[PDB]
Write a protein that binds this DNA or RNA. Sequence first.
RNA 1: CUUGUUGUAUAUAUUCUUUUAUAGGUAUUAAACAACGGAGAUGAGGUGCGCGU
DNA 2: TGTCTATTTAGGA
DNA 3: ACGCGCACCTCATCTCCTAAATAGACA
Length: 628
Amino acid sequence: MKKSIKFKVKGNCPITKDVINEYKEYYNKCSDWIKNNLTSITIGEMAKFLQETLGKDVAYISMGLSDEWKDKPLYHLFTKKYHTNNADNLLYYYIKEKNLDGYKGNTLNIGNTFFRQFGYFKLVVSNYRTKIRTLNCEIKRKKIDADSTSEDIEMQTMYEIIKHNLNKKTDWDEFISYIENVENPNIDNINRYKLLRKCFCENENMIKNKLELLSIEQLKNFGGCIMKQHINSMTLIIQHFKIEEKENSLGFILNLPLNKKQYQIELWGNRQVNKGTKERDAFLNTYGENIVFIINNDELYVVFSYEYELEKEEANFVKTVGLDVNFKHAFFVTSEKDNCHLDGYINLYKYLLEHDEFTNLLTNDEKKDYEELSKVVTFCPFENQLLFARYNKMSKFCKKEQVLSKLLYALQKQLKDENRTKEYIYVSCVNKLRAKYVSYFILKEKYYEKQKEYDIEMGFVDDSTESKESMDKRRTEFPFRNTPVANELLSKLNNVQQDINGCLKNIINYIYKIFEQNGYKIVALENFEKKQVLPTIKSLLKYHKLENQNVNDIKASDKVKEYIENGYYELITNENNEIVDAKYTEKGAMKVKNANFFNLMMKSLHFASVKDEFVLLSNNGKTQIALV
RNA sequence: CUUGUUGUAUAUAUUCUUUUAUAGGUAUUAAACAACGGAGAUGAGGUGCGCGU
DNA sequence: TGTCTATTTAGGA
DNA sequence: ACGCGCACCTCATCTCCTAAATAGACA
Ligand SMILES: [Mg+2]
Ligand SMILES: [Mg+2]
Ligand SMILES: [Mg+2]
C-alpha cells in the first residue's frame, strides 16, 4: 500500500519554524471552535445557513438538509455513516463563511487550498474523526446468564454494536451469518449476540437514545484535539506539484506552488530512492499529494508518499522455531539445542564457559544455570544481576561483572580482527546496550533527584488540594519541565534511548537473519516479574503509620516487619524513644535502586515492540512471524 | 550529491563531563554492514515528584 | 485571449 | 493504597496520503 520517504532540503528554504508555528496556531483555533460546538449546533442549521447565504445547489447541502442529518448533532459529521467529502465541505464552508478559525492568511502566501482547506483543517477533521469513531461509551464485557439484570442484557448489546457499527435490523442477521458460514463456528458465542439482536427489536428507541446520550456524555469532558508545542510539522495537500531529478546529481528538486509562482526546493538524495533502482521509478511515477514539512534538530526535512509493493519470493517450508522473551539471564531464548548447526551464530554463554577466569567465580547453582543456557540457542547475554554491579560498587557480583565485560570486549576485538562482521556488530551492540542501559538508569535517577530538589526548593503551598483552581499557581506556571536543568537531562535521555533502540534493532536483525539464512521458515515469537520497591518514608510514616508508634512494639503489616528486620530503614527517636522521622540506610537505599534498575528495563527496552520489529523484518524477508 | 536518518570504534588528543565514565562532549582519523511508513491525534496502562490521607 | 495557478465539489436514493 | 496537580515513558487504535472541472490572475 502506501509508503513514505523523507528527504533533507539542501540550502536555505523559506519554510522556517515560524511557518509551522502559524500552521499550528490555526490548527488549534479551528479545533477549539470544533470542540466547543460538537453539540451546540446541528448539521441542518449549518446547511440551512449555507443555502441561505450562498444559494447553491450542491450535494453537501442536499445531504445536510435531509431527514437523517438536519437535526442530529454536529459530531455525526465525524462518524462513518456520513459521507466523508460532504462532511468536510459542509464544515469547511461553514467555518470559512463565518471566519471561525481566524485565518488571516499565511506568511509565505501559500495557496489557501493547500494550507487551510486541505492542510490544518483537513488534519482537524481527520483527528476529530478518530476520537468519535473509537468512542467507546463506558462499557465492559460480561458473560450473559439467564438470571442477568437488564444492564447485563443491554451492555453486551451495545458493546458488540460499537465493535461492528450495526444499526439496521438486517445487519444483526449478517453478523450472525458471519461466523456460522465459517467452518466450525462456536454455537454458544453466536447465540449470545442472537439474543441481543432479539432484544434490539423490542425497545430500539431506548437503545439508540441511550447510546447517543452516552456519546453526548463523553463529548463535554473532551478538551478537543490539541497539537502540542514540540511538533515542528505541517502537512499540505497539493494536487499539482512537480518533483524532478536534478541534472548531473543524485538529489531531487521540488517545484512547489508558492505565491502563484513555482519555487524550487533542492533536496538531497537517499540511498533509499537511488539512481537506477525500481523504487526510484515508483517514487517518481506514483507519488501522492501529501507533503509533510518537518524540522528535526534545526534541519528541514520533507516527507512524500507513494505506492510500492515488492514481490515476495517464497521458499519451501523447512522448520518452525519458537522465540521466548526473558529478563533474567538472556533476552532471547530459543527451543533449539545448539549443535553448531546454525551458521553465523555465536553462542556467547558457551564462550563465557570456556574461560576459567569466569567460572571460577561461579557457584554450583550458577554454573549449572549457565551450562543449561549454553546448550540452548540464546541471544544477547544481558545479565541484569551482574549489570547492576557497574552502578553498585559494593555488589557481590562486582568482579563477575568485570570479568564478563572484559571477556565480552575481548571477543568483540577478536571478531573485529577476523573480519566476521555480522557477529562483530552483534557483540558490539550487546556491549553498547549494556553500557547504554546503565547510562540511561543514571540519567533517569538524576532526573528524579533534580525534580525532587527543584520541587522542594520551590516549596508549593496549597490552600486546598481538592481541585486545580484551589492549589498553588506555580504548579502550572513554572513546572520542572520548563526549567533549563530538565531539558538538558531529557535531551541526554533521548540520545541514550536512541542508542538503545538502535542496538536492540541490530540484535533483532541479527537473530532474524540467522534464522532466515539457515532455513527456518517461521519464527514463532512465543508470547514479567516486577520487583517491589520498598515503601517510601512518607508511605512509611503517613501510610503505614510508623509515626509516634512505639519502637519496641510496631503495629504494622508483616511485610513492613520483615523490612524493618532487614537493615533498610533507620528510625529517628524522640524524648519518648518513638519515631518522629525515618530515612533509608545504605542497604535499603540500594535495594530500592536494584528494584528500580530491574523494573526500568521492562519499560525501557521495548519488549512489547520486539514482535513489531520481527513483523517489519518479515515484510521483506524469507521468514514469517507467527504470533503464539 | 561516494547523496538522507539511525545503530555499530572499548580509535587519536583533551587542565571537558560522574548530568551517558567499559560512555559521551569538543575537534580529527576510520569505515563497512544494516534497518528504514510516515505524520497527526485520541485512548489505555505504567511511572517520578510535590501537596493531603 | 491564452496560459498557468487556485478553488470547488464530490450522495444516496 | 487512595485524591488532587505537574510531568515523563510504552503500547494500541484510527485517519490519510483524490481527481475532474471550473474560476481567477495577469501579461
Ligand atoms: Mg547516538
Ligand atoms: Mg552511519
Ligand atoms: Mg580519550
